[PDB]
Design a protein around this ligand. Sequence first.
Ligand SMILES: [Mg+2]
Ligand SMILES: [Mg+2]
Ligand SMILES: [Mg+2]
Ligand SMILES: [Mg+2]
Ligand SMILES: [Mg+2]
Ligand SMILES: [Mg+2]
Ligand SMILES: [Mg+2]
Ligand SMILES: [Mg+2]
Ligand SMILES: [Mg+2]
Ligand SMILES: [Mg+2]
Ligand SMILES: [Mg+2]
Ligand SMILES: [Mg+2]
Ligand SMILES: [Mg+2]
Ligand SMILES: [Mg+2]
Ligand SMILES: [Mg+2]
Ligand SMILES: [Mg+2]
Ligand SMILES: [Mg+2]
Ligand SMILES: [Mg+2]
Ligand SMILES: [Mg+2]
Ligand SMILES: [Mg+2]
Lengths: 60, 104, 129, 88, 89, 70, 226
Amino acid sequence: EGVQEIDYKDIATLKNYITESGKIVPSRITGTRAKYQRQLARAIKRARYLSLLPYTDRHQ
Amino acid sequence: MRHYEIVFMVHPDQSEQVPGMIERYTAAITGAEGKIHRLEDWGRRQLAYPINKLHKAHYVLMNVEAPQEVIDELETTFRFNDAVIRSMVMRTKHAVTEASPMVK
Amino acid sequence: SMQDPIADMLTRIRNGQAANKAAVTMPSSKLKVAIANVLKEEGFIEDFKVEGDTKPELELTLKYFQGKAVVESIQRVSRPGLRIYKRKDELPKVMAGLGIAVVSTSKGVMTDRAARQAGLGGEIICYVA
Amino acid sequence: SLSTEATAKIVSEFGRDANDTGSTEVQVALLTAQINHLQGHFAEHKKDHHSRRGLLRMVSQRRKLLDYLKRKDVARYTQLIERLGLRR
Amino acid sequence: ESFAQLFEESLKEIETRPGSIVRGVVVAIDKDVVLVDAGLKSESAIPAEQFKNAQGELEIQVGDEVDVALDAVEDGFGETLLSREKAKR
Amino acid sequence: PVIKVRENEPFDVALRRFKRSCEKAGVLAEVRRREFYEKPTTERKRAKASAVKRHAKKLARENARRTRLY
Amino acid sequence: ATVSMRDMLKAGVHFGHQTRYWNPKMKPFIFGARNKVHIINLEKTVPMFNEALAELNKIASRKGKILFVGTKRAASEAVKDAALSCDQFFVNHRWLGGMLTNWKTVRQSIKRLKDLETQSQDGTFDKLTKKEALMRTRELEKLENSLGGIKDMGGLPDALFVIDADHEHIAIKEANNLGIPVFAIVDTNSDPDGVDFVIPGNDDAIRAVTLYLGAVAATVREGRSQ
RNA sequence: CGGCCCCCUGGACGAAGACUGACGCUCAGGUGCGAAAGCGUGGGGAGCAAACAGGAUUAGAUACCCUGGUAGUCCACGCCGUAAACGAUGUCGACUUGGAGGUUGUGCCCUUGAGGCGUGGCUUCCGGAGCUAACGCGUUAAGUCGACCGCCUGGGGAGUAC
Ligand SMILES: [Mg+2]
Ligand SMILES: [Mg+2]
Ligand SMILES: [Mg+2]
Ligand SMILES: [Mg+2]
Ligand SMILES: [Mg+2]
Ligand SMILES: [Mg+2]
Ligand SMILES: [Mg+2]
Ligand SMILES: [Mg+2]
Ligand SMILES: [Mg+2]
Ligand SMILES: [Mg+2]
Ligand SMILES: [Mg+2]
Ligand SMILES: [Mg+2]
Ligand SMILES: [Mg+2]
Ligand SMILES: [Mg+2]
Ligand SMILES: [Mg+2]
Ligand SMILES: [Mg+2]
Ligand SMILES: [Mg+2]
Ligand SMILES: [Mg+2]
Ligand SMILES: [Mg+2]
Ligand SMILES: [Mg+2]
């Protein structure tokens, strides 16, 4: 798709790049490019701040 | 003028006041000649984790072109109003006048 | 900064000889052209060619004989940090007269032997062996 | 830093030919404006050492340029330092 | 006297050297191994394992121009990756 | 690391799955690392050493194994 | 006798190695790079090859002892065949360190081999407890395999035709130390500095190897015939 | 220098051009920045922890191990001005075979999809010539050269005394 910037509101893609426990997946495993990887990490963090994603696989 | 992007989560018990709040914020921005490029009430939503022990916060998204002084005032309003649980105003270069992925 | 263009040229020649490059190019100057001419006359290089109008580039065509460089050694003598001038009787003999010494005299840049014959000294630019 | 319009205005004011962005006087003016702008910031943020480093660099460059002007053409130097109000 | 022309005609006679397959004549037959020529930098001593029938006796003798997969050229000494690329699709 | 034992799933199988999940998470390793305070210098050193070790070993393996071993 | 370009192209001499493995001393003998595989300049190859052939022919004419050094298992058969075709000496299996530089020792080995072979074959005594026959046979095989080609060389060779300079680097070095002209086939990965008569070409490919042997063999035969 | 967000701000890099026209490089004295520990005044103090206490170990154990634990570590503003402050490699400029990578630009090409061919910048490893006492460095030089500065002249006494 050649997205200009990964979107923190775009949850499904993020959900594909976080593991079951909520941790950010390494770039070795996901195969993401470094520029995108950084962008993705930032987006995930923002979502977590907005309770769109969870910080951890804990109770809720 | 800096393109901003506001998202604020409101306490679900204050959900009946939410249309009015949106109107108020819009009115103030316009008053200060601020454009409003998209405005999406996402509605009631299940939190990924409980904030202040309460679930299902009412999310509003608002991409705006305004001056920073007015943005500051808006932020202050958010912080002091005991209805909006969280807020986040984050600068953007280009006004993303496009529908959000969850609405899309 | 570049502080010695002649020195740079000499260095270029040496490195070209080392790396077996056929020709070596550098920004041309009048002094440089004179030096190149002297070298060609003495036969340490095959040819030189100045090329361009606004900022011309001197291109020397280097000389090989049996796999090894003709210019065995080529040392700067006078340099910006320490100028060297000699009198006609003090003019140096490089490699006991086999190699040449480029000396800038009152009558232009010439080899050491020529200068000695003329009877005048000058700035000793470089030795070539 | 300095806004685009301001830079353009400065160039127009001191520039022999409005596209003369490189002229020495213009360069000095641009540096001067930047330095003046940054004073307020440094008054506020005394510990912004990196930024002050940048400011120092600007000042040094301006000084060097000014010296060059003095040596090359004195009348221009005198006029310029009168226009800008720089000590000596 | 001229090299571009002959080299480029030899080229035009290549189906696809880079990526998929070229035909080639057998150089020899071995035990679980068959040597098939390539015309490339070397010859393909491909494994005859992929050519294993059900009855144990091999169906490749000296001569066939089998559909060897002629990719991955110049692995140091020669070239060999597979020989059942087109023979499976 | 949430796990739920499926209907008519043996216990041993469930345990195996749980262990696997834990391993993927890498929880024990993290706790072990956080048992005592590693100095920043030490952490840097360990990382650098690991990088060197990996590169050298890989180079030896890829290269080094093109010879008659016996 | 020279070799044609059409034949060379058919053989596959022009192909070289990957661009990461080339030697920049072989950087002149390269035309281009098609699909990350070097292409050798046949324009520079053919005249050089011809010169080498002429020199080889001349040496044969003056009765020079050529040594065909080739150890690649692909080229071992071919080199051996060529040598025997033109009755010359070869090394198809591992080049023993100091075959030429330590010739008086490899000479001792050669003498031992000759004695063993003669007793084994012409002696035809057979009785040796059985152990001796098995052990002796193994020893004989090893010696014959290693030094069978140079057994009749008597002294040192007067020229060394060598398959692949990078693979047979030791041989080239030995030749250089003693001073013997070298006629090496040199792929793009190989180093040409030790070689006296560099022949750019594909050491790996069998057709190319065969072609090299055949041309050299023909020229040596012609020289000997004179 | 490491969560995220905002406000102020410095540098680097690419692209095309346009402009000034040697305005440059280095720099003794001088000036500024300068980890951690340490000092001053006022805050803060969860965790860790010099000193200190007790428990172990031991011939002893003013240590290592254990339980505690105050300065400190944290914040504001001053001072100090040193480290194996290391690449034990001064700054600036030019030239000299290569390979595999990483990061960030950028031109064209059918982007047959993450591609193909260039062209930069910074960066890790391997290695050639050359250099080196050797170890090794090797286009980011410890290679070939030019400019300026700092420094060395046997070990100790001593970076000590005045
Ligand atoms: Mg910035
Ligand atoms: Mg100009
Ligand atoms: Mg000083
Ligand atoms: Mg401190
Ligand atoms: Mg304090
Ligand atoms: Mg007090
Ligand atoms: Mg206090
Ligand atoms: Mg303790
Ligand atoms: Mg404690
Ligand atoms: Mg001290
Ligand atoms: Mg010191
Ligand atoms: Mg340090
Ligand atoms: Mg030292
Ligand atoms: Mg030091
Ligand atoms: Mg300086
Ligand atoms: Mg940097
Ligand atoms: Mg190295
Ligand atoms: Mg001393
Ligand atoms: Mg003494
Ligand atoms: Mg003292």
